[PDB]
């Protein structure tokens, strides 16, 4: 069911965020904007996917 899928996705995201926070002691959750994505791409996490 759709509720099961939504719960699974939320759980996956939360688990990934918790693992990232507990591993490097920080969470890559900066701000965002629709446009003007310049000078902000330097902070390439490459760890959230891991």
């Amino acid at each position: 069911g759709l509720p099961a899928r939504v719960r699974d996705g939320i759980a996956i995201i939360t688990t990934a965020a918790s693992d990232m926070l507990s591993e490097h002691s920080f969470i890559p959750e900066p701000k965002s904007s629709c446009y003007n994505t310049h000078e902000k791409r330097i902070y390439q996490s490459n760890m959230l996917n891991r």
Partner: protein, 51 residues
């Protein structure tokens, strides 16, 4: 029959309009007209898609 197009500089759009006019002249016997619409490239992909 509007025809879109995306060009990096104004000169490219101008020559595209000239080519569309030449094509219309070559097929002037028909009752269908072609209009040239061009836009400039944007650094932001999302902005370009929205435009």
């Amino acid at each position: 029959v509007n025809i879109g197009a995306v060009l990096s500089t104004r000169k490219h759009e101008q020559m595209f309009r000239e080519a569309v006019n030449q094509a219309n002249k070559r097929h002037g016997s028909w009752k269908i007209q072609l209009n040239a619409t061009s836009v400039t490239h944007k650094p932001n992909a999302i902005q370009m898609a929205l435009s």
